Design an enzyme around this catalytic site. Structure first.
Site, PDB file in Angstrom:
ATOM      1  CB  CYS A  99      -3.206   9.070  -1.346  1.00 46.99           C
ATOM      2  SG  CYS A  99      -2.575   7.141  -0.647  1.00 46.99           S
ATOM      3  CB  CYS A 126       0.459   8.693  -1.404  1.00 42.10           C
ATOM      4  SG  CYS A 126      -0.306   7.584  -2.623  1.00 42.10           S
TER       5      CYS A 126
END
Length: 108
Positions: free
Chosen positions: A31, A34
């Site tokens: 991600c 993230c």
């Protein structure tokens, strides 16, 4: 590493039974956003260690805890205090912005 890695099997002991507030980062390895928040949480975990625990929960290896807190997108950050979730933040944030958003009060 000042953050703690938590899993489905350890979540109740490490987060829900914590004496200290615990900021949980629900993340995944692939991600993009993230990654944007990861170094911020590292800094908070070191700088605020006497006051706050910072925990990381990989949603792909721990899909039951993600389901248990209805995490649909990432990053999601949930702050726990004495066993309950008291704040949910969605999206990557800078350090200063994050700490302000975690509060129940505002500056005057």
């Amino acid at each position: 590493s000042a953050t703690i890695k938590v899993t489905d099997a350890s979540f109740a002991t490490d987060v829900l039974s914590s004496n200290k507030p615990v900021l949980v980062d629900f993340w995944a390895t692939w991600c993009g956003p993230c990654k944007m928040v990861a170094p911020v949480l590292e800094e908070i975990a070191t700088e605020r260690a006497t006051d706050l625990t910072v925990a990381k929960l990989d949603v792909d290896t721990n899909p039951e805890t993600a389901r248990n807190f209805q995490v649909v997108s990432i990053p999601t950050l949930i702050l726990f205090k004495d066993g309950q979730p008291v704040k949910r933040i969605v999206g990557a944030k800078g350090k200063a912005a994050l700490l302000r958003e975690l509060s129940d009060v505002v500056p005057n």
